Amino acid sequence: ATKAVCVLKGDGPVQGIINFEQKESNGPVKVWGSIKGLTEGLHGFHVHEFGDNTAGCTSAGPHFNPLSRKHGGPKDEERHVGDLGNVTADKDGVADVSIEDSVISLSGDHCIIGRTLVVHEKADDLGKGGNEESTKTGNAGSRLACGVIGIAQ
Amino acid sequence: ATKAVCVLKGDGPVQGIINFEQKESNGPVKVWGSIKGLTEGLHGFHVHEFGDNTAGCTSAGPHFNPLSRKHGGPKDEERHVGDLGNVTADKDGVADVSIEDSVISLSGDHCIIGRTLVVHEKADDLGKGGNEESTKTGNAGSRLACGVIGIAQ
Numbered sequence: 001a002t003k004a005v006c007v008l009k010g011d012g013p014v015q016g017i018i019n020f021e022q023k024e025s026n027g028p029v030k031v032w033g034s035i036k037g038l039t040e041g042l043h044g045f046h047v048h049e050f051g052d053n054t055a056g057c058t059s060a061g062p063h064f065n066p067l068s069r070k071h072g073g074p075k076d077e078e079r080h081v082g083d084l085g086n087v088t089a090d091k092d093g094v095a096d097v098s099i100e101d102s103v104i105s106l107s108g109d110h111c112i113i114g115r116t117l118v119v120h121e122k123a124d125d126l127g128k129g130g131n132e133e134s135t136k137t138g139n140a141g142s143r144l145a146c147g148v149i150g151i152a153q
Numbered sequence: 154a155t156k157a158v159c160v161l162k163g164d165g166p167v168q169g170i171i172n173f174e175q176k177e178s179n180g181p182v183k184v185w186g187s188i189k190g191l192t193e194g195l196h197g198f199h200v201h202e203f204g205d206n207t208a209g210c211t212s213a214g215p216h217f218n219p220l221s222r223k224h225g226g227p228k229d230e231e232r233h234v235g236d237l238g239n240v241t242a243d244k245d246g247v248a249d250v251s252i253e254d255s256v257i258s259l260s261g262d263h264c265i266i267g268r269t270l271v272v273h274e275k276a277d278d279l280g281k282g283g284n285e286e287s288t289k290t291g292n293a294g295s296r297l298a299c300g301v302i303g304i305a306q
């Protein structure tokens with residue numbers, strides 16, 4: 001069924017292609033692809049509200065959050081729609097992303113097409129950091145690369 | 154009002170920012186902004202089907218055509234939904250765009266969000282070129298710059 005794709009680019013070396021596949025209407029979405037040029041280890045990874053790159057990744061806005069909840073990890077009921085948790089880069093700085101999520105969608109109210117995928121400087125603390133920033137952004141730091149999510153075939 | 158935005162970029166100097174605004178879901182869309190780095194004269198300007206920039210503008214596919222019609226000008230009844238005609242660059246290579254269109258939409262089963270806006274090498278002959286290429290692409294030639302159309306605040 002629906003497919004989407006996103007090319008990640010930023011001001012530094014981080015870049016990559018992420019694919020989205022949703023076989024059934026409001027079934028789970030498979031998210032996979034490769035991002036390079038990352039530091040080894042965990043990096044926050046979220047869908048942000050606006051597909052606006054006019055000021056690089058800053059104009060993407062906050063995490064996509066149509067239900068007005070607090071930040072969390074993807075396994076949590078209390079999360080943003082766009083909270084996809086972390087991706088892990090290996091010792092050569094490559095993240096072979098492989099996620100399945102059933103809260104994002106490629107259609108309807110939780111649709112992420114037209115919005116911005118962002119990969120971050122640091123790990124997402126999944127809302128467990130005990131400060132207000134943790135339940136807003138997970139303390140994942142700056143936006144290293146981003147791309148608008150587009151319809152694919 | 155629904156709003157969208159597109160940052161156009163390519164392998165050459167052509168780049169620009171195009172805004173979209175649609176006050177009513179069943180009303181027209183206003184399209185405006187600027188593109189620079191163009192030769193003076195007319196340049197084809199269309200929404201292509203896929204918001205896939207993995208091969209630059211090449212992976213965007215053909216003009217967005219959900220109703221399976223021939224290529225035309227924006228004011229023709231026979232047109233692709235993606236056909237927005239020509240933009241005009243001045244002698245400084247700058248095209249100031251201001252279009253209103255009532256066939257494209259920012260919502261509904263056939264909206265253009267998540268698709269790719271493309272500005273071309275040559276003029277679009279609006280499907281009146283008298284050859285099979287004309288009723289496919291308008292003879293507008295290569296794709297100089299493009300971007301995925303994203304949701305804006």
Ligand SMILES: [Cu+]
Nearest residue numbers: 045046118120
């Ligand atoms: Cu983020």
Ligand SMILES: [Cu+]
Nearest residue numbers: 198199271273
């Ligand atoms: Cu085109």
Ligand SMILES: [Zn+2]
Nearest residue numbers: 063071080083
């Ligand atoms: Zn979040």
Ligand SMILES: [Zn+2]
Nearest residue numbers: 216224233236
């Ligand atoms: Zn066309």
